[PDB]
Write a protein that binds this ligand. Structure first.
Ligand SMILES: CCCCc1ccc(S(=O)(=O)Nc2ccc(NC(=O)CCC(=O)Nc3ccc(NS(=O)(=O)c4ccc(CCOC)cc4)c(C(=O)O)c3)cc2C(=O)O)cc1
Ligand SMILES: CCCCCCCCCCCCCC(=O)O
Ligand SMILES: CCCCCCCCCCCCCC(=O)O
Ligand SMILES: CCCCCCCCCCCCCC(=O)O
Ligand SMILES: CCCCCCCCCCCCCC(=O)O
Ligand SMILES: CCCCCCCCCCCCCC(=O)O
Ligand SMILES: CCCCCCCCCCCCCC(=O)O
Length: 582
């Protein structure tokens, strides 16, 4: 194509082109104000329009990396604000773009993004919708410089749909706020998952990444042959490697090529890709990534014929260990879409460890004939935990389920700071909301997906404030041992009770006014502090203090003199609670 900027403008359309140009510049120039970014986007959009009219016009034959880099180097505040980043401008392409990628800031130290009042947001959305939605993209993109720009554009369209529906409703806050909370959580999980996949690829290598992708793709495309799944794994691994390097254009072209290959070979891959493959270039790969699991070939043989009974089990294994183990993963995964990827990797690691020992023996068959008996306890351990926790979640609800988790894990790791225990237990309860709603066959893959971000948040929050050797041990374990290590945590019986502080257990009239989330956090902070002060208190002793606390809040938020009630009845509650647990 003669003018790459014109080709992108025509394939994306004016609306998507402007949104992606704003995201790209916001991610590199994180300190510049919104209005300066609007000026850069208008100048780039107009230049792209002169190139769609006449592809031979001045600068239209330049690469998009050259045009983008040229515009970054016209920024007045470049050396003053970004320092070393202005030195990238003295270099030629491709070294200039490589230099700019290295100087992106993962923590730009910007103020917390404050959600305004609902009436204020709806009035701004009505008066200048165009600016309101571009300010969303600007504020999110500048805070997440490595979030894949077209993925951030999908979240932006869901953000618009929440205001379009809820600002016309009778109760605007009751409609909009649960939608903005769900979107905030899903956006943060998406940002964490994108970073996690790159960190795993770098810290554990290409071999481990490929085994995960074989298991995940075999569950999604069970009718595809092993050779087809293996090729898609190699292509997907290359796409992730170049996407993790950080260049938006190399990443986007890589994803489009893979989506085009999948859409040409649909009969060899899946019967669920017809609608995805008709969608435009921007949506196509995103649609394929979230495609429904295709039905597995009806009438499949037992895994014993190829992996236990056959005479060539150890001959096939020695010939190419990774290929044979990948075939076991493919065969096991396509039959079990209900399993987590890590459970499938544990079964393949168990099967690998077995063949390493048994293939050296004189009669290998006699040594590994009972290998499938070892898989039963590994499969049932996460299945029973999900059933037990989902039946507890159904009985208590998200908030009371979060409270049961707070008491349990404060007793296990009481050295972890109260904000980290509150934050992680609240998110663990949110895992129960998003995954216990799905049926049995969809719960373990969902739980694995959200626990991977929740447990990584716990590990990142813990290493900056390291307090528990056991949390450090579970965080530095292999990926298949992380969750089982945390499940193995014992109650810290040698913890010395924290000294009592009256200010901690003092409540005020503001708890009556606070939002549901801010009110819950206050009570959950006090609950963790109560458990740290009295770690040996039983569930019946803590339940009495929690019921007495609830009745106290019930009474003082109805009283005429609320400030006097919270002060007088609160002194009695704290003293009676200390005596009950003394
Ligand atoms: C089950 C667990 C799900 C939630 C979760 C997921 C992931 C984690 S984590 O692993 O600790 N990681 C993160 C933990 C925190 C963050 N947060 C940030 O970087 C702060 C910036 C940020 O994302 N802000 C944000 C982003 C989106 C939001 N939701 S929103 O509805 O889109 C929104 C955006 C903007 C406004 C208007 C502002 O007007 C001035 C109103 C609503 C909101 C919000 O509603 O307040 C806020 C990012 C990550 C990350 O993924 O890098 C923690 C919790
Ligand atoms: C500046 C212009 C940036 C253009 C980015 C194009 C993104 C296309 C995404 C396609 C895909 O993910 O499959
Ligand atoms: C989300 C941003 C990072 C992108 C990493 C590349 C992912 C490409 C997925 C293409 C779809 C293949 C099928 C599938 O993932 O199930
Ligand atoms: C394209 C196919 C290559 C990948 C095949 C997977 C082979 C290795 C599986 C070993 C068992 C899981 C443990 C691990 O390696 O992390
Ligand atoms: C809130 C907690 C919900 C129940 C979680 C149980 C553990 C499930 C683990 C699945 C992935 C794995 O096998 O490690
Ligand atoms: C805070 C520390 C939490 C560690 C345990 C989380 C592991 C996932 C299983 C959750 C559960 O059993 O409820
Ligand atoms: C030293 C003990 C002082 C008394 C502690 C009172 C605070 C307990 C808070 C418990 C909150 C449980 C949740 C709820 O009631 O909704």
């Amino acid at each position: 194509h003669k003018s790459e900027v014109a080709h992108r403008f025509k394939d994306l359309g004016e609306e998507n082109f402007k949104a992606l140009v704003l995201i790209a510049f916001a991610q590199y120039l994180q300190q510049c104000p919104f209005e300066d970014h609007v000026k850069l986007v208008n100048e780039v959009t107009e230049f792209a329009k002169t190139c769609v009219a006449d592809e031979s016009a001045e600068n239209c034959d330049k690469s998009l990396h050259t045009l983008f880099g040229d515009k970054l180097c016209t920024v007045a505040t470049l050396r003053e604000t970004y320092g070393e980043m202005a030195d990238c401008c003295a270099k030629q392409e491709p070294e200039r773009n490589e230099c700019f990628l290295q100087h992106k800031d993962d923590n730009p130290n910007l103020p917390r993004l404050v959600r305004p009042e609902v009436d204020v947001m709806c009035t701004a959305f009505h008066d200048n919708e165009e600016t309101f939605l571009k300010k969303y993209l600007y504020e999110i993109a500048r805070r997440h410089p490595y979030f894949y720009a077209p993925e951030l554009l999908f979240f932006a369209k869901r953000y618009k749909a929440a205001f379009t529906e809820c600002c016309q409703a009778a109760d605007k806050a009751a409609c909009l706020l649960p939608k903005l909370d769900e979107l905030r959580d899903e956006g943060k999980a998406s940002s964490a998952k994108q970073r996690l996949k790159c960190a795993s690829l770098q810290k554990f290598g290409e071999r481990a990444f490929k085994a995960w992708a074989v298991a995940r793709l075999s569950q999604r495309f069970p009718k595809a042959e092993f050779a087809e799944v293996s090729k898609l794994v190699t292509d997907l691994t290359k796409v992730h490697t170049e996407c993790c390097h950080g260049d938006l254009l190399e990443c986007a072209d890589d994803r489009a090529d893979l989506a085009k290959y999948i859409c040409e070979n649909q009969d060899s891959i899946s019967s669920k890709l017809k609608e995805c493959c008709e969608k435009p270039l921007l949506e196509k790969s995103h649609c394929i990534a979230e495609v429904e699991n295709d039905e597995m070939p009806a009438d499949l043989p037992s895994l014993a014929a190829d992996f236990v009974e056959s005479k060539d089990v150890c001959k096939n294994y020695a010939e190419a260990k990774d290929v044979f183990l990948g075939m076991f993963l493919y065969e096991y995964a396509r039959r079990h879409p209900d399993y987590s990827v890590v459970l499938l990797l544990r079964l393949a690691k168990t099967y690998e460890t077995t063949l390493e020992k048994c293939c050296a023996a004189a009669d290998p068959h006699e040594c590994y004939a009972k290998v499938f008996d070892e898989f039963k306890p590994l499969v049932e351990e996460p299945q029973n935990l999900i059933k037990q926790n989902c039946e507890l979640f159904e009985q208590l609800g998200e908030y009371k389920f979060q409270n049961a988790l707070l008491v349990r894990y404060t007793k296990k790791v009481p050295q972890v700071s109260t904000p980290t225990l509150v934050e992680v237990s609240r998110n663990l309860g949110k895992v129960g909301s998003k995954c216990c709603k799905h049926p049995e066959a969809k719960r373990m893959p969902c739980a694995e997906d959200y626990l991977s971000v929740v447990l990584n948040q716990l590990c990142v929050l813990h290493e900056k404030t390291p307090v528990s050797d056991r949390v450090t041990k579970c965080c530095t374990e292999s990926l298949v041992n992380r969750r089982p290590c945390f499940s193995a945590l014992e109650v810290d019986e040698t913890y010395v009770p924290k000294e009592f502080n009256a200010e901690t257990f003092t409540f005020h009239a503001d708890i009556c006014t606070l939002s549901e989330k801010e009110r819950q956090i206050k009570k959950q902070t006090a609950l963790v502090e109560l458990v740290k002060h009295k770690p040996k208190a039983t569930k019946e002793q803590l339940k009495a203090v929690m019921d007495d606390f609830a009745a106290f809040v019930e009474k003082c938020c109805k009283a005429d003199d609320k400030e006097t009630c919270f002060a007088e009845e609160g002194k009695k509650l704290v003293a009676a609670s200390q005596a009950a647990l003394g």
